[PDB]
Design an enzyme around this catalytic site. Structure first.
Site, PDB file in Angstrom:
ATOM      1  N   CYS A  91       4.161   2.004  -7.335  1.00  9.77           N
ATOM      2  CA  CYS A  91       2.901   2.620  -7.769  1.00  9.77           C
ATOM      3  C   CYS A  91       2.977   4.140  -8.007  1.00  9.77           C
ATOM      4  O   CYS A  91       2.301   4.664  -8.891  1.00  9.77           O
ATOM      5  CB  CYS A  91       1.776   2.279  -6.780  1.00  9.77           C
ATOM      6  SG  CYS A  91       1.689   0.529  -6.283  1.00  9.77           S
ATOM      7  N   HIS A 358      -5.279   1.145 -13.410  1.00 10.53           N
ATOM      8  CA  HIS A 358      -4.059   1.596 -12.749  1.00 10.53           C
ATOM      9  C   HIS A 358      -2.859   1.081 -13.505  1.00 10.53           C
ATOM     10  O   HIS A 358      -2.299   0.041 -13.154  1.00 10.53           O
ATOM     11  CB  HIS A 358      -4.099   1.109 -11.295  1.00 10.53           C
ATOM     12  CG  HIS A 358      -2.813   1.302 -10.514  1.00 10.53           C
ATOM     13  ND1 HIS A 358      -1.856   2.179 -10.872  1.00 10.53           N
ATOM     14  CD2 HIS A 358      -2.376   0.710  -9.328  1.00 10.53           C
ATOM     15  CE1 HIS A 358      -0.852   2.133  -9.981  1.00 10.53           C
ATOM     16  NE2 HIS A 358      -1.174   1.233  -9.035  1.00 10.53           N
ATOM     17  N   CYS A 388      -0.658   5.242  -2.609  1.00 11.75           N
ATOM     18  CA  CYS A 388      -0.080   4.199  -1.758  1.00 11.75           C
ATOM     19  C   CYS A 388       0.960   3.440  -2.576  1.00 11.75           C
ATOM     20  O   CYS A 388       0.844   3.349  -3.795  1.00 11.75           O
ATOM     21  CB  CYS A 388      -1.154   3.250  -1.215  1.00 11.75           C
ATOM     22  SG  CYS A 388      -2.013   2.259  -2.464  1.00 11.75           S
ATOM     23  N   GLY A 390       3.949   0.029  -2.768  1.00 14.73           N
ATOM     24  CA  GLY A 390       4.486  -1.236  -2.270  1.00 14.73           C
ATOM     25  C   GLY A 390       5.709  -1.002  -1.403  1.00 14.73           C
ATOM     26  O   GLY A 390       6.467  -0.061  -1.641  1.00 14.73           O
TER      27      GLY A 390
END
Ligand SMILES: CC(C)(COP(=O)(O)OP(=O)(O)OC[C@H]1O[C@@H](n2cnc3c(N)ncnc32)[C@H](O)[C@@H]1OP(=O)(O)O)[C@@H](O)C(=O)NCCC(=O)NCCS
Ligand SMILES: Nc1ncnc2c1ncn2[C@@H]1O[C@H](COP(=O)(O)OP(=O)(O)O)[C@@H](O)[C@H]1O
Lengths: 402, 731, 403
Positions: A91, A358, A388, A390
């Site tokens: 991300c 996103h 944040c 993964g």
């Protein structure tokens, strides 16, 4: 020593997943579009001084395989000496691109660098690239793999964030994104996408639902019946979080990030590099940090990454004018806010990924560019951008208005 | 407005579609545009089909099936070229909208929940076949003259009415591109069925609609669940040869653009690469998205210059020629009984072949029987290849060769009513050769000469009846070259013109009519081209670069290779002739810088292919690489100009020379200039011809006559005053 | 430009061959985890919480190699959750790019200790498995004038006038120096044998090596006919740009091109404080890095401008460099580079290269960097320069100095 400065930060509008305007557009074309915009803004730029192009991309396969950054350099007719490297830190890839660029600049071995990301999720769906953590049983068992929406619900459960709380954040995201657009905040930074004939494909953030109500959000069904969650994953999570009896599934399409297509580009260089190209610095990269937390809960990485970057820069929450944290899920943002006691009116002030979407590999660069603009508009000094990630990772960056 | 079948949604054209609903609920849509002999995709079609398709949706509860038919001799002639040629870059939006509207209509038709059968009575070309591809079943009448295909690439366009999208879903990327799209080949109904473009055939037009209705009736009974559903519209769809993400195709996909680049030789023809891009991109997404991509690529070409060039040449100019624009007015027909050919060299042999194949008796005369026989052997070798490729029957091949009679006796020109002489380039020889024959042939025989440079007026004086003497200029190799350059000498009558014109059509070739002049149109102009290449060699430019410039310009063969095929000794005496002309009138000749190079190669005993040595080395009847000695001789590498400058020198030399030919009245129409330059001397198709090149030039300077003149003047400043534009292009 | 960057450890697996290879049964993740456990063995008291990132090069990050293999390695090896994990792709140079980026992160002062390197199991995840626009997208493919790697290498040979005997002479020389390096024990401390879940040996040597290669054997080989090259067009495409060249001389075979192999490499990069606090001994210092490039059609001309740029920034000349290390993608690439910069033979790829030992795309850069660290130590020499030719016409070069 050397300082890293942001000279330009642009993005495409974001195209929605279902019947999206960008679905017909190759991800390479998205990047090339933005390169042509930079050239338009500085026609007299000596491109030979650009030593690298760094692009975040979470699914580097198909349209997005084969070092898409180099593809952009060549297809845009940029100099053959201008580099081109793809990276993937899930991300945060878009921000990791900017950070790496800043660090290369500071190191003294790179002068002027293009950084950003691209994700065309409607053409290359997430998980397209495979991966051992998910698809190899031995290591899936090891790391206790869990889809991120389950972690998001777990946070809500532990922190005592209710479905109403979570939906209330979503509404505010929609409201703040609509106000930014109609306030003309995004006029300079969002670059409309056009076909080979000059015809308009998309000029705004399609995913936005500015007429969202609290009643409509309450009608939506939990994503726990959606695509990623098949079976088993609640029990895996609760095996680790053994003092938690039951996961409260609060996240839905209405309070999670939109799946979208888009790209972002940022120009970063030394003071000297900007001076001889006649570029005006917009902001300065103050510090960067990589950190992490438990990969099972997965999405609590923003907190220690934020603490670390503040510490590095010798600053506290009180020194920061604006906080920008990717809205993957409402609970992630509420957890972050709780942990660091972030005042409301400082947090995601122009809305986020719930409203605008996103596009994985591009988001970090998009929200980075969003902060450069707000600082300039508000005439404020400092912003902190975090995401944040993964696998339980966290990345944070502090920028300062110049 | 939205998803509408109409061009307009705010506050009119004629109806072109007839509506008929059977007692069984089958609807026949009969296309019959009352404003032409042909059905085209014009504003009236669009509105007419809009109405019909609306009616189809509105009456769906009582419609069981649809039949799309035509009331003309042809099915559908495709896109309206008269509108398409006018499309400027600012019209890209409108073009995009038009083509999206047309496809929205066809998509409704295709996804109606009922069978739709195309009843193809005749030619279905381009937009025409695209209508048929939107149907679920295609029946074609196996009739004479009937063609089916998507030839829009030949006009610098693409199949933008679904052609690309649909053929790719039908055949996969590779087969659709190679078999249908990339070349835009016309197919006979039987061949069209062979490749899956048409489903089944009927003997006569009258059987079509009944057979179509019969098919619908059976389809609804035999396949109720899948009736009116295209294969790609089913859940289990798998694209033949795979999608771009599939391993097998992914492995070979990178080689498609390289293979095309190889075929195109790096020429600037945008249409084939747009077709390939649309094909692959389309295959990556759902049908509707794929179709919209197709429209963007289409609008890209239509508003570009090359499409304009090619549309002008290959539609307007070609049509103008085929309708008899250069043929004299009130002249009747005179059928040819027996053709006599003088000379059994490559030219005479080829002329005898194309005449025999057309169905004429040919007497092929040379100075010996051995010679005349080897001339006939040329046709035998062409038939051997044609039989092996299976393109002819043994019986028809035997009859073709039996029409050719080799002889050495002048008395065998008895009963000959059409003479084509193809002997050595020499006036007195040609005089003598005609002398020996003018009294043996019929009193009304055409006396035709295949001279390349020598004025027809001069050759005519060697005969009694000069009214019947005319230039009939063929091009090597005769079996492949489609142009006949007909040359009117001073004494040539209008009837003679017509008669040869007719002969040219009769043998399946394209005629241009030229006024007598040394070098005529074709030889004079091709000369300037090869002379530019030779000049660069003398200036010190690498031969490899020279050949590359020629190929990347778009010529079928590179100029030094061509210079070998034309003899260097013929080029020498062409220059000697032009020099004598000037020097006799008391003037001073300015030799082309190429002449020193020609003379240099002659001196080295390297006068071309015929002598086994030219710019290339020849071993065992095969060309094999450039002569290594070329570099030391001309100091190759000492001049390194822009590749684009080399390209432009060659193209500009010819374009300028063509304008002179128009000025002097050698040519009488631009149509003739363009088609003659394309079919005669291999001038690049993308330019639309040597005349069109002037008005449709595009480069750094811009576009049009002005941009041409600028670039011409730029070339003159750098390379010599021969690039200065003639006064007829200026202000 | 503040904090100096030091190499503390540089290890690699042996390279497994493509056909009937020893490593075919080994997941690329395991190749990496294995090397992490070696570092753990060598520094059992290292506080891993100080490691802020793991940066891995990978050219085909799909299937077994997708989903950020670096983070997979961090988590699967039980490293701290704070230890990052990022995958990167700069084609052939990816392994060096990881190291370079790692060094640059240390220099910025925002990272203290970083694991860098790369992984490629070409037998499990073949080159091209990831797709990509400039190859698979017609509009792009046309506009970038895409041509396969081997054709560029052959064109180089043609232009510079390297014969088939020339390129095969280098091939023979690589095999000889690789065999000599192995015999001399040069690789003993740095090649980490690969073992299974039970500790049983899978592979302990570079099995692609053909130590008994002869002049005559190489001459008998056929020019490249596998993959992209066998398909049509590419010669013609190349010559359309290089129009002064009449014919490409196809001199490259499987005996003078790098081998398809499986493998991984790991380098430990940190600041002086980072090494001191952990009881780590610096082996080399990263002096400078450079990224440059050349024409994408000829493709493999990238090392020359990259080397000139890194020499310049470090204030050095060809004379100051004791060892030059350049990846042996194709013989002609090495000869061209040697010709451009007048590199003396005795200094160039002195322990042999990828022709002998293989080129596991994403890991090679880190492997040859580690090779130079060991040789600098062994010869007691001072400066090495490491460089790679890259797809798309890129170049990357790094200078190290022995500490
Ligand atoms: C369809 C065709 C075979 C019929 O030939 P035919 O029976 O000899 O009829 P003609 O060629 O004399 O055409 C008659 C009229 O139709 C017109 N016409 C035919 N095809 C047309 C097209 N695609 N667009 C516009 N007008 C067209 C001609 O201009 C002519 O008009 P006019 O006599 O009023 O000037 C022939 O017209 C043809 O080949 N057309 C071009 C088809 C094509 O390639 N287009 C599709 C790709 S864009
Ligand atoms: N022996 C040679 N070595 C290097 N370059 C050469 C040689 N011969 C010709 N060239 C190249 O030819 C080029 C001139 O043509 P080019 O620039 O390709 O045309 P354009 O300007 O139309 O692209 C020069 O740039 C030059 O580099």
């Amino acid at each position: 020593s050397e300082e890293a400065f942001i000279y330009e930060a642009i993005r495409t509008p974001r195209g929605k997943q279902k019947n999206g305007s960008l679905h017909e557009v190759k991800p390479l074309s998205l990047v090339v579009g933005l390169i042509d915009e930079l050239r338009k803004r500085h026609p007299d730029l000596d491109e030979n001084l650009i030593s690298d192009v760094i692009l975040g991309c979470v699914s580097p396969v198909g349209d997005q395989g084969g070092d898409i950054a180099r593809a952009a350099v060549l297809a845009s007719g940029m100099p053959v000496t201008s580099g081109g490297v793809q990276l993937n830190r899930f991300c945060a890839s878009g921000l990791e691109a900017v950070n790496t660029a800043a660090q290369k600049v500071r190191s003294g071995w790179d002068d002027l660098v293009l950084a950003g990301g691209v994700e065309s999720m409607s053409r290359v769906p997430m998980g397209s690239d495979g991966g051992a953590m998910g698809l190899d049983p031995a290591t899936n068992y090891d790391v206790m793999f869990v889809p991120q929406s389950i972690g998001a619900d777990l946070i809500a459960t532990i922190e005592g964030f209710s479905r109403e709380d979570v939906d209330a954040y979503a509404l505010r995201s929609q409201q703040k994104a609509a106000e930014a657009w109609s306030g003309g905040y995004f006029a300079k930074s969002v670059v409309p996408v056009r076909d080979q004939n000059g015809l308009l494909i998309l000029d705004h953030d399609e995913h936005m639902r500015p007429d969202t109500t609290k009643e409509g959000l309450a009608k939506l069904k939990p994503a726990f019946e959606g695509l990623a969650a098949l079976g088993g994953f609640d029990d895996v999570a609760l095996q680790k979080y053994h003092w938690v009896e039951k996961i409260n599934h609060v996240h839905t399409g209405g309070n999670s990030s939109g799946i979208v297509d888009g790209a972002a580009l940022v120009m970063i260089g030394s003071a000297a590099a900007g001076k001889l190209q006649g570029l005006t610095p917009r902001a300065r990269i103050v510090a960067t940090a990589t950190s992490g937390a438990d990969p099972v809960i997965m999405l609590t990485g923003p907190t220690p990454a934020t603490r670390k970057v503040l510490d590095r820069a010798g600053l506290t929450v009180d020194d920061i004018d604006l906080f920008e944290l990717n809205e993957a899920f409402a609970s992630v943002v509420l957890k972050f806010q709780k942990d660091l006691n972030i005042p409301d009116e400082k947090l995601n002030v122009n809305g986020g990924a719930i409203a605008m979407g996103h596009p994985l590999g591009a988001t970090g660069a998009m929200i980075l560019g969003t902060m450069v603009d707000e600082l300039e508009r508000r005439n404020a000094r400092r912003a902190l951008i975090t995401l944040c990630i993964g696998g339980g990772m966290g990345v944070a960056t502090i920028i300062e208005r110049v | 407005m939205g998803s509408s079948h109409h061009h307009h949604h705010h506050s009119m054209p004629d109806n072109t579609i007839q509506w008929d609903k059977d007692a069984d609920g089958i609807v026949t849509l009969t296309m019959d545009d009352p404003s032409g002999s042909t059905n085209v995709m014009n504003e009236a079609y669009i509105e007419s089909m809009g109405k019909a398709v609306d009616r189809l949706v509105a009456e769906k509860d009582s419609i069981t099936g649809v039949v799309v038919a035509s009331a003309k001799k042809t099915f559908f002639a495709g896109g309206d070229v008269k509108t398409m040629i006018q499309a400027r870059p600012e019209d890209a939006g409108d073009v995009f909208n038009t083509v999206e509207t047309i496809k929205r209509q066809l998509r409704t038709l295709e996804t109606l929940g009922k069978p739709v059968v195309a009843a193809i009575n005749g030619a279905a070309l381009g937009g025409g076949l695209e209508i048929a591809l939107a149907c679920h079943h295609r029946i074609a009448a196996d009739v004479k003259g009937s063609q089916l295909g998507l030839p829009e690439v030949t006009l610098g366009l693409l199949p933008g009415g679904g052609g690309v999208t649909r053929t790719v879903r039908m055949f996969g990327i590779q087969n659709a591109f190679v078999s249908v799209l990339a070349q835009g080949t016309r197919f006979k109904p039987a061949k069209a069925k062979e490749i899956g473009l048409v489903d089944e055939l009927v003997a006569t037009v009258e059987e079509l609609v009944p057979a179509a209705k019969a098919w619908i009736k059976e389809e609804l009974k035999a396949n109720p669940d899948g009736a009116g559903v295209q294969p790609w519209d089913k859940k289990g769809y798998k694209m033949p040869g795979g999608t771009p993400s599939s391993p097998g195709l992914a492995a070979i996909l990178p080689s498609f653009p390289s293979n095309l680049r190889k075929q195109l030789k790096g020429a600037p023809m945008p249409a084939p690469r747009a077709i390939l891009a649309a094909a692959v991109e389309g295959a990556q997404v759902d049908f509707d998205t794929a179709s919209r991509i197709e429209s963007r690529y289409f609008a890209s070409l239509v508003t570009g210059q090359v499409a304009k060039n090619m549309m002008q040449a290959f539609f307007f100019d070609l049509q103008a020629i085929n309708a008899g624009g250069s043929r004299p007015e009130g002249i009747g027909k005179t059928p040819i009984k027996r053709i006599g050919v003088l000379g059994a060299g490559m030219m005479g042999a080829g002329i005898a072949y194309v005449s025999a194949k057309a169905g004429y008796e040919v007497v092929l005369k040379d100075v010996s029987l051995e010679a005349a026989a080897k001339g006939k052997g040329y046709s035998e070798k062409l038939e051997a290849k044609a039989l092996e490729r299976g393109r002819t029957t043994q019986e028809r091949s035997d009859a073709l060769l039996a029409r050719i009679t080799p002889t050495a006796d002048a008395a065998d020109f008895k009963g000959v009513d059409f003479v084509i002489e193809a002997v050595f380039e020499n006036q007195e020889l040609k005089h003598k050769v005609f002398g020996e024959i003018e009294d043996i042939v019929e009193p009304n025989a055409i006396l035709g000469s295949n001279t390349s440079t020598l004025p027809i007026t001069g050759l005519a004086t060697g005969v009694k009846r000069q009214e019947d003497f005319i230039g009939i200029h063929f091009f090597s190799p005769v079996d492949k070259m489609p142009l006949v350059e007909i040359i009117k000498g001073e004494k040539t009558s209008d009837e003679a013109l017509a008669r040869v014109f007719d002969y040219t059509l009769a043998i399946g070739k394209t005629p241009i009519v030229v006024n007598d002049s040394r070098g005529f149109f074709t030889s004079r102009v091709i000369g300037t081209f090869v002379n530019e290449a030779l000049a660069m060699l003398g200036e010190g430019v690498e031969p490899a670069s020279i050949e590359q410039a020629g190929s990347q310009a778009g010529y079928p063969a590179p100029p030094l290779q061509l210079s070998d095929e034309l003899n260097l000794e013929l080029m020498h005496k062409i220059a000697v002739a032009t020099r004598k002309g000037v020097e006799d009138a008391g003037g001073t000749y300015q030799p082309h810088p190429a002449e020193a190079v020609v003379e240099k190669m002659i001196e080295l005993g390297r006068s071309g292919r015929l002598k086994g040595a030219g710019f290339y080395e020849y071993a065992d009847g095969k060309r094999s690489g450039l002569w290594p000695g070329l570099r030391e001789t001309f100091k190759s590498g000492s001049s390194q100009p822009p590749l684009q400058d080399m390209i432009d020198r060659m193209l500009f030399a010819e374009a300028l020379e063509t304008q002179k030919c128009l000025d002097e009245g050698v040519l009488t129409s631009t149509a003739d200039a363009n088609i003659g330059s394309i079919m005669g001397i291999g001038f690049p198709p993308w330019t639309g011809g040597s005349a069109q090149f002037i008005v449709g030039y595009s480069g750094p300077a811009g576009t049009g006559k002005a941009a041409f003149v600028a670039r011409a003047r730029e070339l003159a400043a750098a390379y010599g005053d021969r690039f200065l534009p003639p006064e007829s292009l200026l202000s």
